[PDB]
Design a protein around this ligand. Structure first.
Ligand SMILES: CCCCCCCCCCCCCCCCCC(=O)OC[C@H](COP(=O)([O-])OCC(O)COP(=O)([O-])OC[C@@H](COC(=O)CCCCCCCCCCCCCCCCC)OC(=O)CCCCCCCCCCCCCCCCC)OC(=O)CCCCCCCCCCCCCCCCC
Lengths: 69, 36
């Protein structure tokens, strides 16, 4: 025979976990896609000597595109 | 020695009620009605 199993209400914990996952992913999947696309199609800067008479901008002293931005 | 008639009678009544309660815990053939 199959008997009823008495448990506490699991509806609310499951709902909270689903909501948290949804919102975290909703903002974090576009961020991951953007990071991957930037890395693939806009790589990191290459270290080079300062040409004579040139005064670089401050953001030009960093190599990652997101850090530079 | 043994149960007094009051104790025996209370035991029979509680046993009947408990057996009914345990029988009621059984699942009918459709109890897990899964939604789509
Ligand atoms: C689930 C939710 C529930 C709740 C949980 C709580 C969640 C809380 C979250 C809170 C928010 C957190 C946000 C934090 C922000 C941090 C982001 C960051 O800084 O990224 C860092 C880092 C990126 O660093 P970077 O500075 O941007 O890169 C610098 C370079 O310019 C880049 O180098 P590149 O030029 O080579 O380009 C690489 C490029 C491209 O690389 C490649 O394509 C190559 C890969 C290999 C492929 C080669 C073979 C495969 C293909 C072959 C077949 C096809 C070809 C041939 C075709 C025919 C087929 C035969 O890929 C990338 O760009 C990196 C991936 C981007 C990931 C960014 C992460 C953002 C997450 C933010 C959202 C947070 C929520 C999570 C949701 C996210 C979605 C799930 O991202 C990583 O995590 C990398 C980790 C992977 C490395 C390998 C792992 C090594 C393991 C060693 C340890 C071993 C011990 C065992 C443990 C292992 C377990 C892992």
């Amino acid at each position: 025979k199959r008997l009823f199993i008495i448990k506490p209400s699991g509806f609310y914990d499951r709902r909270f976990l689903k909501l948290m996952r949804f919102y975290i992913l909703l903002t974090g999947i576009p961020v991951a896609i953007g990071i991957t696309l930037v890395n693939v199609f806009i790589g990191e800067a290459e270290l080079a000597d300062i040409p004579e008479g040139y005064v670089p901008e401050h953001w030009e002293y960093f190599k990652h595109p997101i850090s530079r931005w | 020695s043994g149960y007094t008639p009051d104790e025996k009678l209370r035991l029979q009544q509680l046993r009947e009620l408990r057996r009914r309660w345990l029988k009621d815990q059984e699942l009918s053939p459709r109890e897990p009605v899964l939604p789509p």
